Design a protein around this motif. Sequence first.
Motif, PDB file in Angstrom:
ATOM      1  N   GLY A  57       0.829  -1.230   0.000  1.00 29.89           N
ATOM      2  CA  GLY A  57       0.000   0.000   0.000  1.00 29.89           C
ATOM      3  C   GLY A  57       0.853   1.267   0.000  1.00 29.89           C
ATOM      4  N   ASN A  58       1.993   1.335   0.688  1.00 26.75           N
ATOM      5  CA  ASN A  58       2.883   2.559   0.625  1.00 26.75           C
ATOM      6  C   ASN A  58       3.334   2.768  -0.789  1.00 26.75           C
ATOM      7  OD1 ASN A  58       2.773   2.577   3.425  1.00 26.75           O
ATOM      8  ND2 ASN A  58       4.804   1.630   3.720  1.00 26.75           N
ATOM      9  N   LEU A  59       3.704   1.720  -1.530  1.00 28.77           N
ATOM     10  CA  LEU A  59       4.168   1.835  -2.918  1.00 28.77           C
ATOM     11  C   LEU A  59       3.037   2.256  -3.865  1.00 28.77           C
ATOM     12  CD1 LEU A  59       6.389  -1.287  -2.714  1.00 28.77           C
ATOM     13  CD2 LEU A  59       7.332   0.943  -3.246  1.00 28.77           C
ATOM     14  N   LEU A  60       1.837   1.685  -3.724  1.00 30.89           N
ATOM     15  CA  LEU A  60       0.666   2.090  -4.558  1.00 30.89           C
ATOM     16  C   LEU A  60       0.380   3.589  -4.440  1.00 30.89           C
ATOM     17  CD1 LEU A  60      -1.876  -0.776  -4.080  1.00 30.89           C
ATOM     18  CD2 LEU A  60      -0.199  -0.504  -5.927  1.00 30.89           C
ATOM     19  N   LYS A  61       0.394   4.068  -3.228  1.00 30.67           N
ATOM     20  CA  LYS A  61       0.137   5.525  -2.912  1.00 30.67           C
ATOM     21  C   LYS A  61       1.267   6.410  -3.427  1.00 30.67           C
ATOM     22  CE  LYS A  61       0.006   8.750   0.997  1.00 30.67           C
ATOM     23  NZ  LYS A  61       0.099   8.886   2.472  1.00 30.67           N
ATOM     24  N   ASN A  62       2.534   6.118  -3.121  1.00 26.10           N
ATOM     25  CA  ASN A  62       3.645   7.056  -3.493  1.00 26.10           C
ATOM     26  C   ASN A  62       4.179   6.905  -4.873  1.00 26.10           C
ATOM     27  OD1 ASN A  62       4.222   8.733  -0.833  1.00 26.10           O
ATOM     28  ND2 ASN A  62       4.203   6.575  -0.135  1.00 26.10           N
ATOM     29  N   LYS A  63       4.305   5.689  -5.411  1.00 29.18           N
ATOM     30  CA  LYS A  63       4.838   5.457  -6.741  1.00 29.18           C
ATOM     31  C   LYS A  63       3.795   5.456  -7.870  1.00 29.18           C
ATOM     32  CE  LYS A  63       8.797   4.629  -7.675  1.00 29.18           C
ATOM     33  NZ  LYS A  63      10.063   5.410  -7.726  1.00 29.18           N
ATOM     34  N   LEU A  64       2.585   4.910  -7.635  1.00 29.19           N
ATOM     35  CA  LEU A  64       1.545   4.876  -8.704  1.00 29.19           C
ATOM     36  C   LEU A  64       0.442   5.915  -8.525  1.00 29.19           C
ATOM     37  CD1 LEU A  64       0.870   1.053  -9.264  1.00 29.19           C
ATOM     38  CD2 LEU A  64       2.523   2.465 -10.466  1.00 29.19           C
ATOM     39  N   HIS A  65       0.461   6.667  -7.396  1.00 31.15           N
ATOM     40  CA  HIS A  65      -0.559   7.657  -6.853  1.00 31.15           C
ATOM     41  C   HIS A  65      -1.996   7.272  -6.624  1.00 31.15           C
ATOM     42  CE1 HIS A  65       2.727  10.389  -6.650  1.00 31.15           C
ATOM     43  NE2 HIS A  65       2.984  10.044  -7.895  1.00 31.15           N
ATOM     44  N   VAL A  66      -2.187   5.978  -6.464  1.00 31.70           N
ATOM     45  CA  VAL A  66      -3.555   5.479  -6.134  1.00 31.70           C
ATOM     46  C   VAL A  66      -4.112   6.246  -4.950  1.00 31.70           C
ATOM     47  CG1 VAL A  66      -4.898   3.455  -5.298  1.00 31.70           C
ATOM     48  CG2 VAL A  66      -2.980   3.162  -6.898  1.00 31.70           C
ATOM     49  N   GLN A  67      -5.379   6.676  -5.008  1.00 28.83           N
ATOM     50  CA  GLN A  67      -5.888   7.444  -3.882  1.00 28.83           C
ATOM     51  C   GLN A  67      -6.073   6.594  -2.674  1.00 28.83           C
ATOM     52  OE1 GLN A  67      -9.578   9.546  -4.945  1.00 28.83           O
ATOM     53  NE2 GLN A  67      -8.967   9.254  -7.080  1.00 28.83           N
ATOM     54  N   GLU A  68      -5.837   7.213  -1.523  1.00 31.20           N
ATOM     55  CA  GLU A  68      -5.852   6.667  -0.154  1.00 31.20           C
ATOM     56  C   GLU A  68      -7.141   5.923   0.219  1.00 31.20           C
ATOM     57  OE1 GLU A  68      -4.324   9.486   3.229  1.00 31.20           O
ATOM     58  OE2 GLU A  68      -2.943   8.001   2.408  1.00 31.20           O
ATOM     59  N   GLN A  69      -8.261   6.456  -0.279  1.00 33.27           N
ATOM     60  CA  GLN A  69      -9.603   5.917  -0.028  1.00 33.27           C
ATOM     61  C   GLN A  69      -9.815   4.506  -0.605  1.00 33.27           C
ATOM     62  OE1 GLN A  69     -11.909   8.374  -3.668  1.00 33.27           O
ATOM     63  NE2 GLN A  69     -13.183   7.580  -1.975  1.00 33.27           N
ATOM     64  N   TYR A  70      -9.051   4.147  -1.632  1.00 31.24           N
ATOM     65  CA  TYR A  70      -9.150   2.824  -2.265  1.00 31.24           C
ATOM     66  C   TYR A  70      -8.051   1.824  -1.808  1.00 31.24           C
ATOM     67  CZ  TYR A  70     -12.054   5.635  -5.285  1.00 31.24           C
ATOM     68  OH  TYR A  70     -12.989   6.534  -5.775  1.00 31.24           O
ATOM     69  N   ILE A  71      -7.139   2.265  -0.944  1.00 29.53           N
ATOM     70  CA  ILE A  71      -6.073   1.341  -0.451  1.00 29.53           C
ATOM     71  C   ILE A  71      -6.472   0.730   0.894  1.00 29.53           C
ATOM     72  CG2 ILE A  71      -3.629   0.937  -0.037  1.00 29.53           C
ATOM     73  CD1 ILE A  71      -3.070   3.659  -1.629  1.00 29.53           C
ATOM     74  N   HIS A  72      -6.537  -0.638   0.934  1.00 31.66           N
ATOM     75  CA  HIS A  72      -6.933  -1.386   2.116  1.00 31.66           C
ATOM     76  C   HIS A  72      -5.757  -2.291   2.582  1.00 31.66           C
ATOM     77  CE1 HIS A  72     -11.291  -0.366   1.973  1.00 31.66           C
ATOM     78  NE2 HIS A  72     -11.038  -0.228   0.683  1.00 31.66           N
ATOM     79  N   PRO A  73      -4.863  -1.762   3.421  1.00 29.24           N
ATOM     80  CA  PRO A  73      -3.755  -2.596   3.943  1.00 29.24           C
ATOM     81  C   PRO A  73      -4.275  -3.557   5.004  1.00 29.24           C
ATOM     82  CG  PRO A  73      -3.586  -0.306   4.774  1.00 29.24           C
ATOM     83  CD  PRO A  73      -4.653  -0.303   3.753  1.00 29.24           C
ATOM     84  N   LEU A  74      -3.802  -4.812   5.002  1.00 34.27           N
ATOM     85  CA  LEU A  74      -4.063  -5.778   6.084  1.00 34.27           C
ATOM     86  C   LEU A  74      -2.798  -6.250   6.768  1.00 34.27           C
ATOM     87  CD1 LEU A  74      -6.595  -8.089   4.079  1.00 34.27           C
ATOM     88  CD2 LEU A  74      -7.146  -6.115   5.587  1.00 34.27           C
TER      89      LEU A  74
END
Length: 341
Positions: A57-74
């Motif tokens: 999830g850190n990589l999706l957000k910072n490297k691909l810019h996926v918005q925070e609202q759609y990232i679900h870390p477990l």
Amino acid sequence: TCPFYKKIPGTGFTVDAFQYGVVEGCTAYFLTHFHSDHYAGLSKHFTFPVYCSEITGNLLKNKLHVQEQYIHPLPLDTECIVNGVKVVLLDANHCPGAVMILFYLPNGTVILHTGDFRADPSMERSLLADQKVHMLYLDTTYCSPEYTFPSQQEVIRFAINTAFEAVTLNPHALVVCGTYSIGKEKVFLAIADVLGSKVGMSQEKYKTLQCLNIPEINSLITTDMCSSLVHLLPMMQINFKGLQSHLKKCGGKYNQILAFRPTGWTHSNKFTRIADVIPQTKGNISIYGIPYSEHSSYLEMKRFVQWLKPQKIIPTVNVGTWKSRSTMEKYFREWKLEAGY
Ligand code: NI
């Protein structure tokens, strides 16, 4: 269109399926790890729930810019309910953030998806010990007995001793390590630690490493190339031309390069022990290819599967040819006859 071996029957779930547009019926997209063949398709415009590890999830957000609202870390090793179905994430012993996913289906079937993994006997004492698996979706990258390579610890021992000897003989040598993805960070971290140096790299690579939750990372890496005697370069530059060109830039600080190219398996593993490995050399430049694998060897794979005793195996790698599929099915049947499941 999404292939069958990426769908999890009896759920709204897919695994590593972002390159096919909107998958019909998919309510949650799992991502096993941050390698490009598996994330192909994700971006800032993605608007469905993505389930993954914290590091992914850190990589999706910072490297691909996926918005925070759609990232679900477990968290790992923890029973979680997703869209009414119990799941567990387990460490895959692949790259940072890489997981296997256990799915407990509403009908009583248990499925394990390995993602990409390097099987290890330690996995025999995870939450897998506790219960039966009906279906195994398996990383079959090296499913043939010719695929042999040493332990990661032996490979690191060879690299540290090689680098420490060279720089002690010549304090004016630079060490260079190739990279093209996350994974295999122990190669350059262990060499820099023996030399008493930080690892130098580009801003883009520094950014990526900063997403990986490596303890004390600020003490280990830097963007100031001139302060560092271990440099990282893209893998494509690890050749006599690219290295010559790099040595020019260092302003007569160095008069020799020793370089490492971590590969997967190569056919020179069929003849040469790790101890006996020699470099390619042109002038003041030497290049070592070292077989640092983050996938199971044939033997490691067979041990895992004979321990788990799954009822059915679905391969996820080497699935495109009839000859590959037939070869893999033969070995699954030997393993099953030999062990008695
Ligand atoms: Ni991978």
